[PDB]
Amino acid sequence: VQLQQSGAELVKPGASVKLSCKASGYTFTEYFIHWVKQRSGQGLEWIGWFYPGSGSLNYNGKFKDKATFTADKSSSTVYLELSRLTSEDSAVYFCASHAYDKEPYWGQGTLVTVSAAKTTPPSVYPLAPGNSMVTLGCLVKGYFPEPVTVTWNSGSLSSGVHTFPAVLQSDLYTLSSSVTVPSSTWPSETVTCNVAHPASSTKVDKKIVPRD
């Protein structure tokens, strides 16, 4: 049994989105389909079940005005429609199937991002200090959408790095990356952060230099 889900979605608030889940190899011994929501860094929440054999369904009361289950028998595919999208609907949505009194199988999940933002490259700022180690960094601010890729010295510097998960600032993303090297080696052996943002087709370098 294999569950195949549709690809990632970026959609604007107020709109609606239609996610798909294609079950495989049950095949004659039909199944209930469950949908589950997981917000970024959060736990799991049950949306409802759908029974393709009759079209019967059942929603968690919390989702009764948000979710709509439908199906296509030709394609052995079931659908989850989410309407009147808000930021609260941004999440990964999982589909899971199971025959009567049998263990469930889960899909890979579909990422839904609800945002009005447009593609925006990051501003990249050096973090330089105002012991035996020194910590430097760079601030990656005001970009959309995720992801960005941060490296140091084009990747030759990788030990002692912490690149932090991005966070929403206004309706744009911001992250930071710190790097720690021996004090005796900076500024003599240069340190430069590199930030790639695929969606904006940009890649910028910011050398960290001592403050005046």
């Binding site: 799991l44 899909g107 200090p129 105002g130 710190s178 720690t180």
Partner: protein, 217 residues
């Protein structure tokens, strides 16, 4: 609805240790057909939950036998004999007996190590940002243990709440520490009206905060 109460939220262990995770239902979860549909899942980052135990005590095929489940009425327990690295992640229970189906809040299984105070570094706004009219002050709180930590920002001695954004790393795969980033974002206009900027870390390693500051001068 059936409330599933999962404890503990965090479970630090050493490799080879015995781990026990529990789940309490607010009411009985015996399905009409006589079965108790209590399942246990392990979830790794960016991955779908993987089934470990179903119907309270039944190991899903391919799951190693160091995993076992038991329980009755309203108390259920997952046990892991001799924890391995591939066991680390977040565990969820799920009752499937009475709709709406409900999950426990989860348990993070992570690694134990010696306590470590954070290495705290503070950074003024760059001239590049100032020229654009913004002013972010960044504080890194790196390589600490255990994971719980608080950050407080002061501007000229007075506590500041608005414009602060925080981010946390997952447990480091090599030294088992945690790290945090805290950024205070102001406008240049407001940043230039004050002198002292301070970030304060409170962590179990001391009752007094670790304080880092700079003066705009």
């Amino acid at each position: 609805d059936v409330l599933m109460t999962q404890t503990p939220l965090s479970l630090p262990v050493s490799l080879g240790d015995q781990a026990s995770i529990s789940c309490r239902s607010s009411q009985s979860i015996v399905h009409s057909n006589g079965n108790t549909y209590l399942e246990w899942y392990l979830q790794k980052p960016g991955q779908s939950p993987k089934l470990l135990i179903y119907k309270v005590s039944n190991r899903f095929s391919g799951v190693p036998d160091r995993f076992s489940g038991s329980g009755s009425g309203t108390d259920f327990t997952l046990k892991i004999n001799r924890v391995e690295a591939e066991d680390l992640g977040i565990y969820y229970c799920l009752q499937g007996s009475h709709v709406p189906l409900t999950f426990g809040a989860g348990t993070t299984l992570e690694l134990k190590r010696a306590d470590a105070a954070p290495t705290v570094s503070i950074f003024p706004p760059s001239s590049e940002q100032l020229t654009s009219g913004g002013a972010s002050v960044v504080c890194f709180l790196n390589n600490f243990y255990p994971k719980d930590i608080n950050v407080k920002w002061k501007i000229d001695g007075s506590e500041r709440q608005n414009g602060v954004l925080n981010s946390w790393t997952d447990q480091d795969s090599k030294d088992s520490t945690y790290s945090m980033s805290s950024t205070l974002t102001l406008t240049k206009d407001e940043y230039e009206r004050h002198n002292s900027y301070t970030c304060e870390a409170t962590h179990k390693t001391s009752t007094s905060p670790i304080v880092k500051s700079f003066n705009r001068n």
